[PDB]
Design a protein around this nucleic acid. Structure first.
Lengths: 342, 501, 342
DNA sequence: TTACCTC
DNA sequence: CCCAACTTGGATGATTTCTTCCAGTCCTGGTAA
């Protein structure tokens, strides 16, 4: 192909904030607190050296405590509902390369995006993204509630409401008056993703029914180990409110990673879906599912466009003929990045 | 005494060696060993022994090939290719740059030449000017040669070195191609586009490290992992480099805009208000998008900036694991590397002076929709959003009257800031220190770039011609809403709008 | 062993708050007081040096007081009953490693948890945890009442009632109508520990009948060394109420340290139970029961998993055949943490 | 296929 | 509506400021032969 090729990102979210209501004011932030604790002396190198060779210490030396400083966050007594919200904008921005160093490569990438659009296929991507919003998986470790409600508004005037999100699976069929809203939402998004000159903007709120003083899990900061012992080892992310107070939040890219978890196209065995990645990275197992050695990765597939366009053009469309390799590639172009040295 | 090593460091004031050339050769040669092996830099015997080792000296002579005036690797050790040696650009009265500083060189190649590079690349004051050992020997400076032969060097060994030492400084002063890990940005110049690549000035950064500590300026520190892999100065400073820190004291009308994670580090020298080159950039990408929607010619003469909220965010981003541990037969993924930056969240309004060339204009609802569509999603490296939907009002209004527009603007909250252009011309950091001591409204800002060469065709350029440049440091004023309520619409529309050139 | 291995925490409380009721309002917080006192000059080193000559002090020099600043907490006059409340969530979360870098380790840890589940054994752990809730040992030093009444509600609709908890032992036979509730509670929890996707909650409130102005013992802060003569030498923990008042509390991990105190499998002599710890730490005597030198610790045992699975598979089960070494291991996996750098 | 270094 | 508003003498004495033992990791570099 060519020395330089790249796309920017087409689907971008905001920062999510936690808050609650009172009888006296409509918006009170949830906030974090800091505290000293007494820890344990446990684990390897604490008692063993090399490969299971005990080291020489006295019996009493492990009964001592290990103090630490952490930040933490809890819902205060007597709050019945906790609320969380974020904004979302979607642009039809995978139709054109941000940069390209070769006119012959450029005309081909354009041909492909269009050949795909008219046969169907944006619906498929929209259905998958839509499902992840309405399921609620973007709450990560805070999904364990006594009841979760999700509400969405858009710039076109529509409103959607899931009376209880706790049971919607990735694989399966949704209850009536829920399955239907998934279809309607899919239509708005499928268009926003591919047709330009449409402004679309969404506002997603949810509510969590909680326990008496339940623990809450906001995003964590990346830090250096302090050398002071007066500074926290585990620091949490907050956002500044319009009134000057700070509140617990979830970072944009953490919301984003959840929304794009849609890849169950690998190895012809769906399992659970992966975060889209050029090499099929699997963070839980610390490995990769589309190792270059298999021929299944993005970079091998990027060179078969001429063959794919030929098929797309020869196909009738409107059926189930689109192959995994074409869908995969379109999903990667949506999460744009650097595809150079080709 | 460790103070001798401090005074010979790249971040310290230069010291005189006139009449001491003999001990200067001894100390400078002794610096090529690890600190653990040397009880003193003053032992003549060790120096006479080190000098006889042609291999040790040969390894030292080889480092000369990568001495530079500007450092293409500074922000990112991954950049690979040739060195850059250029005389400082002509002085611009309104810009702080290397133009007002004397000639100095530094070193940065494979990270294992930290000690061996010190024999020729260490500067000092001599005959009341700034020089170093390589220059005095290449220029055939007899006093240094007489001392060097006296310390045990054979005349024949010196006659050969003068040639090889000179040869290493006679070529490879400009890169052949643009390196794949360098920065590239493009703007209009003389009616067409040109790609600009910035680079950090060695002389300018080294001076700043001394001035902020001596003049007691507001500053912070940026960390670098593996200092030996970035350069002479960063290594000498232990991976911690000081920068200035000057935060703010906090017609088409765009209201309520929110930016997440904006880059708060304008240039490698200054933290504070985001680089103005980025806003000029934004105005234009917005103009091009609108022009592809409306058949009529549309053009932006000026752009204004207002600050309602400013919040600094601590910490740093973790890179995506985009790099395989090994190219083949390995199923492990590694992290490319880590950088130390600064970020903030903004809330701001813009007032753009929009002009339509055609006699008949399109003041219609359709155009207001197209103005909402054309709005970019990216700003200053962060993410840009409109005001939230549940509380939406008309955030995109248009005025064709200065009286109505000024009247509405006078109503803004008292705790915000307008940013105005400054009048003062500054040529050094010391002049900036005095100007900042006297005012309370004055802040340094990044303003643009200064060229090192004329635009040329060069392999690796994204589009058309390519040029190298250094960052331009200038200033701006922070004005309270109360001051313009009194100044009047006359002063506001004359002074309150910014432009390029 | 391997480089990466982690489990999450499968059982946890939120925090406990002290309060009382009045005729006009259902929730009045118990609060703390701050005061200066006159102490004693006493103890070794006051008058001695390495137990030799007792310094050079005149007789009158020890008659002087030693002032100090402390915080304290008392029940106000005429309040007949004090209430303490917290909530508990349990997850079936020891069935699978949060992170594992070795596919051969992973298949074994899964096989073991499953082999264990179907022979019984979660019932055993559930009984041990359940006993500690009903006994009331989580009140620590506040158990000295004129009568303690404990009531529990759950998300499945059950209610339990212990009319008087002051006398139930770890070892013994509980009186009728109480033995019955222990069995019923055991069954709900046994399921919560092993079956996924059950959202189970318990809500525990206890009533304390107290003295006229009895002293109360909430959690203390771990503080920095003072040197300003102005900061209290002993400080108590509180929570902030939605109305801005502060209230006395017991920390989450302080409640948890009591609930998980079920380890009497060492030395073939049960005595009193220890808090589960990889090295068998005993805080009362400042020692360690499962010192690496004995071969009885977690890390020695973690390497024999292949042999335990083999035994379990050859056994019948459903009886009392499971050995102490298997129970210990499962108990540690329940309090998940880091098990790394093999 | 192996190691070598910044106050 | 309209007119007023206060001088003075004075503001403490004794002696003491505590202790024990602990401070966890792990994945995240270019360059040369």
């Amino acid at each position: 192909l060519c020395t330089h090729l790249s796309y920017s990102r087409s689907l971008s979210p905001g920062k999510a904030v936690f808050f609650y209501k009172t009888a006296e004011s409509d918006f009170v932030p949830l906030r974090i607190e800091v505290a000293k604790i007494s820890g344990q002396k446990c684990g390897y190198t604490e008692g063993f050296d090399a490969n299971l060779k005990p080291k020489n210490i006295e019996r009493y030396e492990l009964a001592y405590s290990n103090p630490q400083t952490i930040e933490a966050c809890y819902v205060p007594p007597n709050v019945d509902e906790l609320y969380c919200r974020f904004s979302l904008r979607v642009e039809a921005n995978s139709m054109r390369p941000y940069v390209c160093s070769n006119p012959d490569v450029l005309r081909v990438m354009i041909g492909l995006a269009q050949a795909y659009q008219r046969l169907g296929g944006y619906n498929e991507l929209a259905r998958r993204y839509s499902a992840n919003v309405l399921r609620g998986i973007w709450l990560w470790r805070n999904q364990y509630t006594q009841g979760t409600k999700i509400e969405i508004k858009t710039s076109l005037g529509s409103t959607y409401h899931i009376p209880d999100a706790r049971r919607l699976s990735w694989s399966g069929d949704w209850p009536e008056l829920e399955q239907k809203q998934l279809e309607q939402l899919t239509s708005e998004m499928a268009k926003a993703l591919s047709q330009p000159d449409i402004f679309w903007f969404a506002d997603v709120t949810a509510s969590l029914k909680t326990g008496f003083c339940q623990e809450i899990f906001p995003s964590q900061k990346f830090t250096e180990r302090p050398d002071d012992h007066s500074v926290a080892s585990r620091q949490l992310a907050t956002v500044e409110c319009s009134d000057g107070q700070l509140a617990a939040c979830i970072n944009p890219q953490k919301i984003g990673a959840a929304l794009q978890k849609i890849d169950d196209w690998w190895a012809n065995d769906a399992d659970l879906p992966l975060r889209v990645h050029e090499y099929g990275a699997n963070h839980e197992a610390l490995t990769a599912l589309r190792h270059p050695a298999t021929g299944q990765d993005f970079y091998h597939l990027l060179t078969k466009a001429e063959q794919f366009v030929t098929v797309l053009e020869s196909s009738e469309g409107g059926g189930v003929e689109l192959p995994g390799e074409v869908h995969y590639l379109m999903a990667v172009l949506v999460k744009g990045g650097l595809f150079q040295k080709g | 005494d460790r103070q001798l090593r401090r005074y010979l460091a790249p971040y310290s004031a230069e010291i005189g060696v006139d009449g001491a050339e003999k001990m200067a050769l001894v100390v400078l040669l002794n610096l090529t060993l690890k600190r653990d092996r040397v009880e003193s830099l003053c032992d003549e015997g060790l120096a006479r022994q080190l000098l006889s080792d042609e291999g040790h000296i040969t390894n030292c002579l080889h480092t000369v090939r990568w001495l530079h005036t500007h450092n293409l690797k500074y922000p990112d050790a991954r950049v690979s290719g040739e060195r850059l040696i250029i005389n400082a650009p002509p002085l611009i009265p309104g810009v702080i740059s290397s133009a007002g500083l004397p000639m100095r060189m530094g070193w940065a190649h494979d990270s294992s030449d930290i000690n061996l590079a010190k024999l020729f690349g260490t500067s000092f004051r001599y005959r009341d000017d700034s020089t170093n050992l390589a220059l005095q020997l290449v220029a055939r400076s007899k006093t240094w040669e007489q001392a060097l032969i006296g310390l045990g060097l054979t005349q024949q060994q010196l006659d050969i070195w003068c040639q090889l030492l000179a040869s290493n400084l006679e070529n490879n002063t400009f890169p052949t191609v643009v390196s794949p890990f360098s920065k590239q940005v493009r703007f209009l110049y003389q009616g067409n586009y040109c790609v600009v690549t910035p680079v950090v000035s060695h002389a300018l950064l080294a001076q700043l490290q001394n001035v902020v500590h001596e003049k007691k300026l507001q500053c912070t520190y940026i960390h670098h992992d593996h200092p030996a892999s970035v350069g002479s100065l960063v290594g000498a400073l232990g991976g911690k480099v000081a920068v200035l820190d000057y935060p703010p004291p906090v017609y088409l009308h765009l209201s309520g805009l929110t930016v997440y994670d904006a880059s708060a580090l304008a240039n490698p020298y200054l933290c504070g208000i985001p680089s103005l080159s980025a806003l000029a950039g934004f105005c234009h990408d917005y103009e091009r998008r609108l022009q592809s929607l409306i058949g009529q010619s549309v053009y932006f003469r000026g752009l204004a900036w207002y600050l309602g909220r400013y919040s600094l965010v601590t910490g740093k981003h973790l890179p995506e694991p985009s790099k395989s541990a090994d190219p083949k037969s390995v199923s492990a993924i590694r992290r490319p590397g880590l950088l130390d930056g600064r970020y903030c969240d903004l809330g701001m309004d813009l007032i753009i002076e929009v002009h339509i060339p055609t006699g008949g204009s399109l003041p219609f609802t359709t155009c207001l929709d197209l103005l909402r569509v054309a709005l970019p999603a990216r700003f200053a490296g962060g993410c840009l959003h409109p005001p939230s939907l549940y509380e939406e009002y008309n955030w995109c209004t248009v005025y064709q009257d200065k009286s109505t527009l000024f009247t509405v603007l006078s109503r803004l909250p008292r705790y915000g800031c307008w940013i105005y252009p400054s009048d003062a011309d500054l040529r050094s950091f010391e002049e900036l220190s005095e100007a900042l001591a006297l005012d309370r409204r004055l802040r340094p800002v990044a303003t643009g770039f200064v060229f090192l060469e004329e635009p040329v065709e060069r392999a690796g350029s994204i589009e058309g011609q390519h040029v190298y440049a250094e960052s331009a440091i200038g200033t701006a004023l922070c004005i309270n809403p109360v001051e313009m309520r009194l100044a009047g619409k006359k002063r506001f529309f004359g002074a309150g709008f910014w432009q390029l050139n």
